[PDB]
Write a protein that binds this DNA or RNA. Sequence first.
RNA 1: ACUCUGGUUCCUCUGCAUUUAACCGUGAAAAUCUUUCGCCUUUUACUAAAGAUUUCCGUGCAAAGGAGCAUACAUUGAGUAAAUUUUUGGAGUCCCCUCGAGAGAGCGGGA
Lengths: 97, 81, 33, 98, 312, 97, 71, 48
Amino acid sequence: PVSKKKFQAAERFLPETVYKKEYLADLMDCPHIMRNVAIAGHLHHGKTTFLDCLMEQTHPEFYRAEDADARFTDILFIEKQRGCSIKSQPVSIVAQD
Amino acid sequence: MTSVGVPIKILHEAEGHMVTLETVTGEVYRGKLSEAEDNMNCQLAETVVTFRDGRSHQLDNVFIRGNKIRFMILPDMLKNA
Amino acid sequence: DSILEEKSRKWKQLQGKRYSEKKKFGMSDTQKE
Amino acid sequence: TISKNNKMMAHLNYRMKIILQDGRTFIGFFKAFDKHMNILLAECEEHRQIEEKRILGLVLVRGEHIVSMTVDGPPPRDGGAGGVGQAKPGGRGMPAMP
Amino acid sequence: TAQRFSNLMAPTMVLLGHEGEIYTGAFSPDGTCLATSGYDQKIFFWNVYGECENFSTIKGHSGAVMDLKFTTDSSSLVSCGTDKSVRVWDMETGTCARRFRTHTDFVNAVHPSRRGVTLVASASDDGTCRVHDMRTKEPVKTYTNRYQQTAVTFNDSSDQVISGGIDNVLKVWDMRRDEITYTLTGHRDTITGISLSPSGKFIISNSMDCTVRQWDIRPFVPGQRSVGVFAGHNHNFEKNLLKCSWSPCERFITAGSSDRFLYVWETLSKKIVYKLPGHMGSVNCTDFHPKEPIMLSCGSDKRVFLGEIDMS
Amino acid sequence: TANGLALLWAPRPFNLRSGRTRRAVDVPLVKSWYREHCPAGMPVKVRVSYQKLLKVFVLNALKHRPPKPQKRRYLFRSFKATKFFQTTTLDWVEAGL
Amino acid sequence: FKPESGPVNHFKSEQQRSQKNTLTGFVEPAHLNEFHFNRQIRSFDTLGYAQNPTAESGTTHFVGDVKKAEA
Amino acid sequence: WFYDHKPLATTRFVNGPTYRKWAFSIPQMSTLYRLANQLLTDLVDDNY
RNA sequence: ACUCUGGUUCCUCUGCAUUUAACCGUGAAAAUCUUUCGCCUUUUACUAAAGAUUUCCGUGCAAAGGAGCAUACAUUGAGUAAAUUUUUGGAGUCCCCUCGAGAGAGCGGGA
Ligand SMILES: Nc1nc2c(ncn2[C@@H]2O[C@H](COP(=O)(O)OP(=O)(O)OP(=O)(O)O)[C@@H](O)[C@H]2O)c(=O)[nH]1
């Protein structure tokens, strides 16, 4: 019955963040602040590991191994195994200038 | 930046939003705080000025010298910040 | 009162030895030297 | 009170009544201050002498204009580990007697 | 079917989790909780009702705990132990609000003031009876006796401190005089515990001579203060400081006993009517729940018993 | 500095400088040799032996199963706890004999 | 506690009438202050007397060469 | 110290006689790296 | 202003090491059940692969207690210590008109 269909990581809870979720959801009402961005690269340039640094700063609980990239935005298990990114994934975070 | 006090930090988070500030001469300015400074100079845009007699007028931009501002009503989401 | 002096002495030894730090709970995992 | 760190952290979040040099009375939950004695009042209201009450938002008062402030009301308000023992129901075994 | 008398889940409960010999146990005055401790040094809190789960446990003691009493408002638990220290535990935080440390030898017995400023009477193997105050490092009063003191209580007005000890006779000190106002004489061996009546008129005192003696501590009595003597319990060669306690209606008195039996006496007749087996060793402490007819007993058998009775 | 930079791409363990310590039975001194490839010149016997050692390594890695979390059965501590066993320091040829 | 009413046998006198559970005796678990129990062995062995272990010991507080206990 | 039985165990480079952790410098690490050479691979491995 | 503790090392106990892409182990054994090839006048012991389960050699961290070696009170968790334009060194007082018994307010006027 408990079919092991799992093909992607999905988090069992909301992880901790430095910002309150309420301040994120309130800032959503204010496009005079918010920005949208895409990060685009040749294969295996910085792009995914750089977002892991933005994750590590906002989250505190975000474990990065000393040996290998965590690659949080590479959620699929094919992307974990291949380690190239294969599909886009979005992040939303509050961050200070 | 250097560690300026929390009220000045909250003032810069108020830059996105509408703020309402009263000047020492009594006029109330409501507008969208486009720049603020650590001396709390304020630049407002899309401004409405309300005079002490209750008349009002629109103003496209206003610069208020920081030491002439009595108080500002900030938006509530900044309480979360 | 001299009997109370003796009883005071007896009580001091008994409670001293009973509670003694060498005998408190959580002790004598004794190392096989 | 303020600046004495053990004391200052407890005087924040009190509901405080602020008197300004124009004679206004503001009331709100005082929850930030600055070396220039600027103060930030959450959920603020004003009382103007004539008394009339008006509701404001989060109000930043530039410190230059404060005369004085006083406590109006308390901050809002709302071991834990064990589990070693167990407590099943039972009964009393009768011992021996002489 | 059978008669029931309390909200207990069963007419007796066996509480297991201790490993040390349990030397003391008391209910919270609100009736929600009880706390128990002894040679394990860990103070175990238990709920009175339902599964009675051990919701909290406080460490921090490093010498075994002689005696343990709640403050009247139930905000704090006061406990003392052979670490020469008196420790006051905040009930909400579970942390040591005060650690009085001026005793020079084992502290065996503790009693908080009933009302006014929170004061803690304490008695010790250094022979001093000391009253501490939450507000000061130094104690308010130190009364020194030549012989070790192992029981203490205030009176209800919290202005006389009654301390008993090796002397068998009782040094009762009046806190405005700093003198013994009177002594209570009848005990042939050391006094293992004293408990003040709910109304404050009387105290019971338990002693190693295997009797509990009831004393009238009211300001005027026209003759001898000995009201009565209770017997039937026993003190064994362990020489424990077996405690005693009052029923909140005063009609019943209890004392610890080395014969494993939970004794209850009727105050006027001094007869026994409850002799409750179930323990496997010396019953060091016994107390009544303050609102409901539940008996607590703590024993050297590492077990705590809760049970309900027909208090008549 | 020149040596420190060279260590960064030394083979493991030499790219570390701080490490947990490992049992002498676990250091498999020759294992990198059979992993990498046969040298072009080595004859029949040795080439076949490289394939057989890869087969053993590939079956070991394929089957694996991660270790169970358990209470470790310390058994020599259980002997040492009883009165019947004593401990002493001995010379390996004495202990062997 | 109230005692069983009526006569008691002449058939089965002072050993056999007593309370028992195992074949000779009432056996029940006990816990004590180990250290004090250790003390009471050592006094009986070295000195000839001990403080009476029994529950409900009554007046018989001590058990041994009572002349030594009093002296 | 190279041929001691448990080398360095009584020194600041390893936690103690349980011999569970080590922290060598670079002068040490480059020297034993150079001695190990005959056993080691040449590769910047992963692509090969 | 408060309770709170000596370093280091070692022993033993207790808890957790299931979200496995993957890994408590940069190493790598054995057994059982079920299933599929090859030896055999018989069974074990076997060949070599899969799946499900165990055992065994190890492992990590945290906490607790104790025991040993050289010895020191600070300090952890809980909290202190600048008069020249934008705040913390007075552009402040007084004297008229208005509403109102009263005392304040009007981008009020003026010395
Ligand atoms: N040397 C070095 N390598 C890095 C650095 N940052 C990332 N890399 C390596 O480059 C590889 C790819 O990193 P990723 O974050 O997956 O790069 P990527 O571009 O997101 O991969 P794709 O987006 O799929 O192309 C990994 O092996 C990283 O270790 C770096 O700062 N220095």
